[PDB]
Design a binder for this molecule. Structure first.
Ligand SMILES: COc1ccc(C)cc1N
Ligand SMILES: COc1ccc(C)cc1N
Length: 286
């Protein structure tokens, strides 16, 4: 009701995001390995970083939870010769993914579903989830990891890439001034950028996975890559200010410059992180 309306206020057209993102319209941390990659190349490098952890063999089925514009699923079909299932809650992303997957020269099964993981109960081999706020941004971590564990075979693996904060206790350790300042900035992100969202901690991502029965090796920090990503997003949005304002408003432009510049700052000050966590079932190949 009211809340919904107050949140709907912060809905932004896909056309605005196109004015700061790379041509793939990837809205997640890029991977600058090597460091000289373009943003677009680094976004393909991040997809590869995720898929290369999943022990994908031809004829397997990969589930993409929050499949975005279909880039991850397409790369998986092309590189690994796998079937793919994507989950998205965006009608626009659903339509684009169906066309992206239909375009692929393959006999492998390609399916895109307009639903959450809560309503998904089909057997799959491997799972990838890259900064899926619509799926991994509303708690019920115990149900999420239990679902992922139960739909995979004995050798199942999953990657989840997510922005993270620290427990208030850990934040206090690194300055009380900076601790409050960060907590107020997180409140802005979860009010105006990802309304109703909840930023997990790495410790939560690890411990909820372990409780479900997964082996969880040391998470990969993407912090330095997200600083680079947010710098390019900010610099690109600023270079398109007139076009961005015309498509939305000066309010929305200022909101996203605050978000992009702000995240770069709190990432640089090591008050935010980005974790790529691998979840291994007990029977996962060594
Ligand atoms: C992946 O980028 C897109 C998504 C949706 C539409 C209509 C166009 C493009 N280029
Ligand atoms: C990584 O997925 C997310 C992105 C943004 C926010 C606020 C929360 C989550 N889980």
């Amino acid at each position: 009701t009211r809340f919904e309306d107050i949140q709907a206020h912060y809905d932004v057209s896909d056309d605005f995001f196109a004015l700061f993102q790379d041509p793939t319209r990837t809205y997640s941390c890029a991977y600058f390995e090597p460091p000289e990659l373009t943003l677009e190349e680094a976004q393909y490098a991040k997809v590869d970083l995720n898929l290369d952890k999943l022990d994908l063999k031809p004829g397997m089925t990969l589930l993409d939870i929050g499949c975005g514009w279909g880039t991850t699923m397409r790369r998986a079909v092309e590189r690994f010769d796998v079937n793919v299932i994507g989950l998205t809650l965006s009608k626009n992303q659903h339509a684009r993914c169906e066309q992206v997957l239909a375009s692929i020269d393959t006999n492998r099964s390609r399916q895109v579903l307009l639903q959450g993981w809560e309503d998904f109960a089909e057997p799959v081999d491997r799972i990838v989830s890259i900064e899926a706020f619509e799926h991994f941004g509303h708690e019920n971590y115990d149900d999420f990891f239990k679902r992922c564990f139960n739909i995979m075979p004995a050798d199942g693996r999953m990657t989840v890439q997510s922005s993270v904060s620290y427990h208030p206790y850990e934040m206090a350790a690194r300055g009380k001034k900076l601790s409050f300042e960060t907590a107020r900035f997180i409140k802005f992100i979860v009010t105006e950028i990802f309304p109703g969202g909840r930023l997990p901690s790495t410790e939560m991502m690890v411990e909820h996975g372990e409780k479900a029965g997964f082996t969880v090796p040391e998470p990969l920090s993407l912090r330095p890559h997200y600083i680079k990503t947010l710098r390019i997003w900010g610099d690109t949005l600023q270079s398109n200010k007139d076009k961005a304002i015309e498509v939305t408003s000066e309010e929305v432009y200022n909101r996203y410059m605050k978000y992009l510049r702000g995240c770069e700052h709190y990432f640089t000050d090591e008050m935010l992180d980005c974790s790529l966590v691998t979840y291994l079932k007990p029977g996962a190949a060594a």
